[PDB]
Ligand SMILES: C[S@@+](CC[C@H](N)C(=O)[O-])C[C@H]1O[C@@H](n2cnc3c(N)ncnc32)[C@H](O)[C@@H]1O
């Protein structure tokens with residue numbers, strides 16, 4: 105019936121439960137018919153930095169939540185902000201089925217609204233990594249807002265998808281220009297448009 109509802113029907117009919125990999129390729133076999141390419145990059149970041157506390161901005165149907173949760177340590181948590189409650193619902197389901205729901209808490213609303221609440225309401229000290237994948241013209245404002253709430257320590261890794269195609273030249277000008285962020289660029293490729301795109305790692309310095 106709709107794109108998101110039947111991604112979930114597909115996953116649930118074709119994937120193996122508690123098998124996150126299968127859940128992942130269920131979504132990016134269905135969708136071929138941040139995929140598995142921009143995926144290597146995510147996997148490498150998690151693998152290198154082993155963050156205890158990850159904030160994802162934008163869970164669509166659950167792909168990058170599953171992707172990252174998969175590789176998190178027993179103790180760790182992923183907070184995922186999704187402003188759309190129907191995607192929140194689908195992300196939820198996707199996680200349960202992947203058996204990763206113990207590691208992920210789905211935060212439900214606008215990023216600009218939930219971020220200020222992170223310390224007092226969800227008991228955060230500082231974030232170990234932030235995956236930015238929501239509204240393109242929020243990357244910079246939310247980065248600044250994260251900084252203001254002192255949600256970033258030195259070493260917090262930020263990872264911004266779609267950086268590149270379409271958007272985010274301001275974000276890039278700021279983090280590469282600011283000396284409170286050490287930046288690295290990673291290239292990625294978009295399937296039907298045949299375009300080089302990219303992600304940006306920006307490691308907070310203070
Ligand atoms: C491109 S999708 C996320 C893709 C996802 N990271 C993945 O890998 O599957 C963008 C998502 O962020 C949500 N979104 C956009 N702006 C937002 C905001 N300011 N706060 C929270 N969610 C937002 C949209 O509803 C949408 O689900």
Ligand SMILES: [Mg+2]
Nearest residue numbers: 138237265266
């Ligand atoms: Mg993306």
